[PDB]
Amino acid sequence: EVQLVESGGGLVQPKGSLKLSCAASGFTFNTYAMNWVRQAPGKGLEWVARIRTKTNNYVTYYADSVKDRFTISRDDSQSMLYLQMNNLKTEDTAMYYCVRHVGDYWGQGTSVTVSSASIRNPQLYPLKPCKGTASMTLGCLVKDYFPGPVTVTWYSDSLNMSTVNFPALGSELKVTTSQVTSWGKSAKNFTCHVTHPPSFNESRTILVR
Amino acid sequence: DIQMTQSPASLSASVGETVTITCRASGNIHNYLAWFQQKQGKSPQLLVYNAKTLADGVPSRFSGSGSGTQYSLKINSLQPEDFGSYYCQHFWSTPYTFGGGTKLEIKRADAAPTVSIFPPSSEQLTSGGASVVCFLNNFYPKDINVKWKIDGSERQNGVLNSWTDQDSKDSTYSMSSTLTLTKDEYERHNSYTCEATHKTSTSPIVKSFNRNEC
Amino acid sequence: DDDKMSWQAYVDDHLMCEIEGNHLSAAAIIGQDGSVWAQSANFPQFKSEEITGIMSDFHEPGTLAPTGLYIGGTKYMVIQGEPGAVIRGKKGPGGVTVKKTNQALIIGIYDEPMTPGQCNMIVERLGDYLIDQGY
Ligand SMILES: *[C@@H]1O[C@H](CO[C@@H]2O[C@@H](C)[C@@H](O)[C@@H](O)[C@@H]2O)[C@@H](O[C@@H]2O[C@H](CO)[C@@H](O[C@@H]3O[C@H](CO)[C@@H](O)[C@H](O[C@H]4O[C@H](CO)[C@@H](O)[C@H](O)[C@@H]4O)[C@@H]3O)[C@H](O)[C@H]2NC(C)=O)[C@H](O)[C@H]1NC(C)=O
């Protein structure tokens, strides 16, 4: 029932500005204090901001790291939380979650990359067994993209379908691999659907004979 | 400000054993401390809120303990789904600082990999490139070595290697070796082998014939 | 509304814990209606009119000042607080802090050797903590 969905993340050049949003559903949003928490790509968690309810005049508390640059706000009439970011530094590149009170419910997360480089939409290649060596395992190769992340999701007509995604590898141009493993009765269709943050959607279909 | 120091940094334990992760504050946080578990690629999840109160849907094998400046999280009867990292956060005064985290690996019986190779795609080949991909799917421990041999000649410069976290139920790692080349470079030769060394009795390998049979 | 932590646990582990070497003398979580949700062993028994006077000062700050903060038949002189949020009283070396939540009242009574700032700190924190869940 309780669901927090972040949005707005993306790639921004240094000293840029960006406004992340968080949509809350399933609870009376006006009665709870909200948080923004970020996690660096390989590092740990860091608390960055908190806002209070109408009872205490919507007070706001920030971290010294983002003290004079970031602004947290809320619209309880629309059950929305916002994080305004200005003068974005490299150290701000992280994934951002909205968090309710002490952490009972977190959000999916929105990724933000602060870099001088330019967005490269990924290239998807279907990898099939060699003719005659056919096996249950199939997969997809996502290559040469920035900034990430990519969400590779499988759709097939088989049951007992296992999906293993592998962490991305690289700075600037990154690559990543996804493997599907089917068992039981054979299926005719194995389609992998890859999403890149700036409204990039593409699919590659592997038909089996 | 109240900074918090967590220990240990990494812990490994066979299934069924018991571990405690301790977390220390620079001042009395008066039992305003929460525990979070996080797995790779997903958002954190609250296990223990306040010193000892378990959140909804948390197994009772998590005992939250502590007082004053030192608190700890006990996990008795460890289960294979308890891999990941654990962070402690205080809520006494702003800033509500997190911790450094403790990565938990699940000690497990040794298993050998299963290697499956794949040749370059039709779309990559028409793009001017070629990448032979190799998926080692289930093994323990994560330490493993890979060797790409083109016509029996070793090549090591252009291979990328991706590792995964432990499986939720098998506690087995997985790995991906992808060797990328140009179209002329890959079309000159015919035999491609992907070899892995783990338990070291012998190296499991798979091969393709660059359209000679493919 | 979270029902997983007992109000007794709140008063015991967040109101009567050690702060700066001292302890509160007594503490309680009470509803604005007057129903005590939890209270320590030595917390006094309120009177109905005393709670209503407290609540009237929260509704109009400065109205309890002529009467005084009456808690358990004991008269405390009202001192400075936060309008509509905190009501404070002094009875010589001791005193009391009443923090308002959305539905309840957090009350802490101290005596020497306890400073008023330490009683303020503990009581008001649990107040703000529970306001942020809607409690
Ligand atoms: C192989 O599998 C892929 C994936 O399909 C998914 O998995 C299957 C196992 C099965 O469960 C499917 O139901 C499931 O979607 C198939 O590729 C998908 O094909 C459909 C049909 O083209 C696409 O659906 C489209 O969705 C659009 C919005 O999302 C929608 O606008 C499209 O409709 C349009 O066209 C019709 C016809 O004129 C018109 O009436 C509409 O008003 C509209 O204009 C359409 O519904 C999916 O996007 C495709 N991709 C994915 C990832 O789902 C594939 O067909 C299947 N078979 C083969 C042989 O490849």
Author numbering:
A (entry chain H): 1 to 209
B (entry chain L): 1 to 214
C (entry chain C): -3 to 131
Please give me the paper's original passages concerning this structure.
Here, we report the first crystal structures of the complex between a murine Fab/IgE (heavy and light chains naturally paired) that recognizes the allergen profilin from natural rubber latex (Hev b 8). This profilin is involved in the latex-fruit-pollen syndrome and oral-allergy syndrome and is highly cross-reactive. Profilins are involved in multiple cellular functions, such as motility, through regulation of the polymerization of actin microfilaments, binding proteins with proline-rich domains, and binding phosphatidylinositol, among others. The murine Fab/IgE 2F5 is a non-recombinant IgE obtained in response to immunization with rHev b 8 allergen.
To understand the strong interaction between Fab/IgE 2F5 and this profilin, we determined two X-ray crystal structures of the complex, at 3.04 and 3.34 Å resolution, from crystals that grew in different conditions. Better diffracting crystals of the Fab/IgE 2F5-profilin complex were obtained with the DDDK-rHev b 8 construct. The elbow angle for the structure at 3.04 Å is 131°, while the one at 3.34 Å is 113°. A comparison of the two structures of the Fab/IgE 2F5-Hev b 8 complexes (at 3.04 and 3.34 Å resolution) shows that the Fab region of the murine IgE 2F5 exhibits flexibility at the elbow angle, comparable to that reported for Fabs from IgGs23; nonetheless, this flexibility does not affect the paratope. Our Fab/IgE 2F5-rHev b 8 structure at 3.04 Å resolution revealed an electron density in both maps (2Fo-Fc and Fo-Fc), interpreted as a branched oligosaccharide bound to N189. Positive Fo-Fc electron density defined the branched sugar molecule bound at N189, which we interpreted as a core of N-linked N-acetylglucosamine (NAG) (β-1–4-linked), an α-1–6-linked fucose (FUC) bound to the first NAG, an a di-D-mannose (MAN) attached to the chitobiose core (GlcNAc2), using the model-building tools implemented in Coot26. The Fab/IgE 2F5-rHev b 8 complex structures revealed a conformational epitope constituted by the first and third α-helices of the allergen, corresponding to N- and C- terminal sequences that came close to each other in the three-dimensional structure, and a nearby residue in a loop connecting β strands 6 and 7. Profilin has a conformational epitope with a buried surface area of 926 Å2, as we determined using PDBsum28. The rHev b 8 conformational epitope comprises 18 polar, acid, and basic residues. This epitope involves residues Y6, D9, H10, C13, E14, I15, M117, I118, L122, I127, Q129, and G130, which establish hydrophobic interactions and numerous nonbonded interactions (van der Waals and electrostatic) with the CDRs. Meanwhile, D124 and D128 establish salt bridges with CDR-H2 residues R50 and R52, and the profilin Y125 establishes an aromatic interaction with Y32 (CDR-L1).
